[PDB]
Amino acid sequence: EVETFAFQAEIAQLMSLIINTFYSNKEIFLRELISNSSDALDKIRYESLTDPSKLDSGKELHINLIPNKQDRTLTIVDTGIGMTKADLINNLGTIAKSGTKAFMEALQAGADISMIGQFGVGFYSAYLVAEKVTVITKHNDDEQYAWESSAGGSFTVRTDTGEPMGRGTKVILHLKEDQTEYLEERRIKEIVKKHSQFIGYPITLFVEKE
Numbered sequence: 001e002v003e004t005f006a007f008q009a010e011i012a013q014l015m016s017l018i019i020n021t022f023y024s025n026k027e028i029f030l031r032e033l034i035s036n037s038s039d040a041l042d043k044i045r046y047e048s049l050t051d052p053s054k055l056d057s058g059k060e061l062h063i064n065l066i067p068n069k070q071d072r073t074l075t076i077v078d079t080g081i082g083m084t085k086a087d088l089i090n091n092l093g094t095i096a097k098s099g100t101k102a103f104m105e106a107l108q109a110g111a112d113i114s115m116i117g118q119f120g121v122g123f124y125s126a127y128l129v130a131e132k133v134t135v136i137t138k139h140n141d142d143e144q145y146a147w148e149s150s151a152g153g154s155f156t157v158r159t160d161t162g163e164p165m166g167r168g169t170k171v172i173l174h175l176k177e178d179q180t181e182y183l184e185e186r187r188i189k190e191i192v193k194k195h196s197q198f199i200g201y202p203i204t205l206f207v208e209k210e
């Protein structure tokens, strides 16, 4: 039921640099994931202009931030375009249209990790704070899939049943033990205000029930 894949070599190298470089300004991961969500929302907004039935899977365009202290997870949910199975494997597993090469060269020429979004690889900044990342996604043209990786050079993809989402993507960050500050309401609010205050879709920060 589960397929296991190797990252393209350059992607594994990039992930290793992100995981092993001493770099304290880890909060920038959230900006990068929210920007990726905003881009995905732009895409379905545009496609629905000439094909309104693409919103049959949900008209609302928004971003949800869901902390769970019991599971030690932070989840970033959007109702954007979503990804097909091929999209997951290509976009997360290979260089594809990213600036992976430019970023790694830039780091050797005076750039720092906070500039990762300039190079189209902001998603991998999740590994600044997460030991494992799970991506659940549903595109209008495919079934629901789950991508997962704890780095180390490989990732898995499986069909995801139970809790079907209408359309969009959930990025589930299983946080490192010493990065639980990013589950705290005050900290998340601070980061969103600092780095994501002009995003063109509603960002809702969920409250914990306990």
Ligand SMILES: CCNC(=O)[C@H]1O[C@@H](n2cnc3c(N)ncnc32)[C@H](O)[C@@H]1O
Pocket (backbone or CB within 6 Å): 036, 037, 040, 078, 080, 081, 082, 083, 091, 092, 098, 120, 121, 122, 123, 124, 168, 169
């Ligand atoms: C890992 C670096 N590559 C990407 O992030 C690409 O993966 C896709 N992607 C990333 N996040 C999302 C998302 N929330 N929704 C849809 N596609 C995404 C986009 O095509 C990105 O350009």
